[PDB]
Amino acid sequence: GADGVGNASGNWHCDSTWLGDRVITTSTRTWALPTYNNHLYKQISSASTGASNDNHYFGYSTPWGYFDFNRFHCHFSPRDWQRLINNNWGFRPKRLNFKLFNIQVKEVTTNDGVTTIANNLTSTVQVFSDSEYQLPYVLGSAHQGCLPPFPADVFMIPQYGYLTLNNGSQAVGRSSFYCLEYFPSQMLRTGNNFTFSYTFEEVPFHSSYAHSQSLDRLMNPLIDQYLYYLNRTQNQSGSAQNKDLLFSRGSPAGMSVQPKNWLPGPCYRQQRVSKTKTDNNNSNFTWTGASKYNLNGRESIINPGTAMASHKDDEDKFFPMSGVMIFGKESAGASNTALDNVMITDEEEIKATNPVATERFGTVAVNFQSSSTDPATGDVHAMGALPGMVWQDRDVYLQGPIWAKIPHTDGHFHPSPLMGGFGLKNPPPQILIKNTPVPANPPAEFSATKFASFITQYSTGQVSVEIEWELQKENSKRWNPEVQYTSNYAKSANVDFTVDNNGLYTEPRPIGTRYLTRPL
Amino acid sequence: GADGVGNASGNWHCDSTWLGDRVITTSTRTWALPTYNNHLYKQISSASTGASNDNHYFGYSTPWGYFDFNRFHCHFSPRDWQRLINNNWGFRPKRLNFKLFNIQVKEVTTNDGVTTIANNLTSTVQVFSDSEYQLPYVLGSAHQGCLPPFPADVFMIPQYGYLTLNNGSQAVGRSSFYCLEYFPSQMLRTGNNFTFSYTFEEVPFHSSYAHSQSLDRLMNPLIDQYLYYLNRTQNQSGSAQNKDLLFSRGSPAGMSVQPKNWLPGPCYRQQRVSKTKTDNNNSNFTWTGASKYNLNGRESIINPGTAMASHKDDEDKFFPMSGVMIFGKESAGASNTALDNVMITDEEEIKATNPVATERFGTVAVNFQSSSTDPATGDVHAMGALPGMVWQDRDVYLQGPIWAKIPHTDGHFHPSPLMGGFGLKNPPPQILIKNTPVPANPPAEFSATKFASFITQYSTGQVSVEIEWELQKENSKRWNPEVQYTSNYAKSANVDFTVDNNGLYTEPRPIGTRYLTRPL
């Protein structure tokens, strides 16, 4: 971008526009970027520490920061989310426009015990988008540091670091190291700005609806089937019990025994825990009772895991130990905070098609019955994909992620990001940004030793992201009224999704998207 | 319409189409029309009867029936109403298309004690629209007999009758008598059909919103005014009480005493009654405590009367004796039915601008204060229009009326129909319909006496009304979520706005339109 100390390089574009089948969100925020690692790349790992084998790692931390808008509230105000979710069966991102501007680099000089800041007019900030995905993709891990939900909040840019192969806390020859400078980047003084655009690949619309039928209630409740099933293996009060083979035809009084076309979704059972502590076992079972996967001798909690309904009817007090997305309140501490400082999602709407998360998928025969041997069956707790299965993916939330990069593998299977959202082969590129090192005064005599004395600085500016979203309109012939997300009409001390008397914006609950209904 | 015994003259067009700024409702129903008054026009009145002076009348009943779609649920399904009200700040009718067809005239012959019906193929039904408004306008009095809310219900056509001037139970020379035949009408046999279209005049969009500010809270809560008001007429702890004139400037701590630009709406006070009977007086006060107007020595209850808020904050248990629209449940008896068989509307949203219906409008000076004479004031219970007043009209309901004819008078004042809806100078014309008399066998010898022997018959067919409605879209920058009409998510024995196990459609509550919000 071209021109002045004295001249803004961008305006403030923060707004929504609804246009029939499209909605265009624009959001702009003011950021702050410190100097990280003192302009150094450090090797990092779990060495010392005392970490268990399931926590070892090797990687590198970087002098760079990055931009992250991978959360719905970076784009949708609460009211817009409401508009979205109460009138559409779905939506997807189509295109994006990104803007960095009004940059201002500042130097900090400290004497005492006391601190002066001034402008350093001839200083630059550097930027690039990793558009060929040459860097480890660190979005889609649900990190904090995204654009804040509230447009008036200033935010600090997160620091980029990444991991590679590790054997315990050591590295392997196959471990990759990346230097960000080695990339062409744009260098901006206070006059300049950065822009780029991006188009999203074609992706299925996110399902913003619950079903109003369930897999097991698809039949016509008036008519028999023409199909028969073995109903009894003994009579039938003719005294007493005699071996028999008796067959019945499908009938509305026996909807549990009717032949059908479809199976419910996959299942990886999880441990059921109550919100009233008195119901639970008196031990610490989370790691030990947890559903985990085992990768190169390292255990990892499956969380949130397969899309599964959180609880069956009437049991809203239970939840899978690690099968629901959980947001912290703005009072929550980092670790071992209490139940009332968190917000647990509920994915109950999918119980029309998806197994409940804390129960068996079902039952299977396990032997050959005969006069000598009694029929046996077993419980199935982990069921992979079977032809004929159908299921609903995890819901998204106003404060959850939007997308993730599908790993570059030979094989995926339904690569919808398990934490919720859109899987993208070629996702929105990472956007990296750094303050250029500015040497302090060198000595009078040459020295070859790497320069280690710098003027202390940081930068600030605005960033703007515009996304176009396509909508799937609702076409429902449903006669009665829908469940609709609504704010509460009763009176209170504070308004939901507002700032308080100290100016702290709060999000008092998660909001999903499943209010409108479809048939199956 | 042209053609066959064997040939339908219309199809079934029942559907909604949403199109950005327009929504087009089509509804079609199946009707039944008996022979009324045996093809006679009768003079009718309150003579004998024992009626009080406030109930006397004179008029005429007619052999004709009529069509009435003047209720929102004749056009909007519950789900559509929901769509309407949760996304628009307003709406109005623009144009209409009406269709009578598939007519079938039948003769009834009874011997015994037992009854045979057959087709009378060569019989006609007659129809016309009173498009020059030459007939007494009987729509907009909230009569029953409109198209039913539920498309599968068959309905009987109401009978047309009208009133004229009466002096007690007698007539005056100025009294008008109308013969409907004297009008050209279309004569339809089983093959034929009737159609006409109509355009609505320009009218203000109905306000489907509550305000989120009130008249008395329009100021900037941070800043003083530059304006002053007399604050004290005595000091001010300098002992003891001394005459003084002390002036203060408008201030956020004194929002009740700040000069302002606007006044709240008009007021005609009504008697406050509680839903818990124990609160009320032990008498029958409705006529005797009622707000009434007096017209030519005849009293009439003002009901619903001036648009006024039903109750102030926290007092949802009170309601004006005759200032709220009240719908009957499908269990309600015609007279003296209990509280739980009715549904009382609530117009509480308008308390931002409109006086509460059971309180004074305010207080007025009534004398000249002096050292000798103490300042007096009086309560104002009935306040007409004052320059600077602003107000909100009564809300409409999914089951309330749509429009009424503005009377043809020299003078109206804000002629919005007090029961709610659109006032129309030139409203949708009345549509009249009758089975043509079919003589029974005459005698063999002439007789001049009016024929009085007829073949018994009635007719049935379909009717279709299509209305185009223009929408006022919402443009709100409100950050937090709105109150939205929503059905209840908790489980129950029946679904709202559905048929039961005997196939009776029920409407379990009124729904207004005021959910979205505006600023004032």
Added chain:
Amino acid sequence: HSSYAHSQSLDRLMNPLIDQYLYYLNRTQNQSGSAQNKDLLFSRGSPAGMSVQPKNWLPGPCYRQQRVSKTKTDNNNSNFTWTGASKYNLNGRESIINPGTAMAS
């Protein structure tokens, strides 16, 4: 200019054959059971109760005036025209309102 009388009145606009779908509070007590007891009883608009039917319209404005008879014997024995008159007050000066608001005689 309206050179016509109406042949209907504001309070007689309804269809005299059909009920309304609208209800109004009819009684605040029953109803012979023996005594008087607090109650809330609602009735629907009906041709037998045209004085209690909901309606859309109100009659015109009103500024009441003193009724006087053409047969003198009916009237009060005093001179009440200025003193019983409907007057407006303008800058401390009274003026008889005459003929005043359009009202039926």
Added chain:
Amino acid sequence: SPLMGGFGLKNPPPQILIKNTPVPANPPAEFSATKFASFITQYSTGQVSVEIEWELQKENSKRWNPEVQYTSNYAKSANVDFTVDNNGLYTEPRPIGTRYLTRPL
């Protein structure tokens, strides 16, 4: 693929709904608002026709020996398969699948 067998279709042949239109019996002489509940008893009859085009995958087999083929039974009996009996009742005496020709894997 529908587990009971057949073709799964995103956008399958639409449901086709049909009903006899209500035909009121004689109404009363005086208006009543209550649900109309008296009807002339009726029913209907007619023909319906469905035509479907099916594409075939022809067999291209180099298999030298003869195939298993669905065949009716040559031995004599009291009734013919897939026929009506002496009371005119059509019967289907067995299921027939479709897997007779063979492929290599």
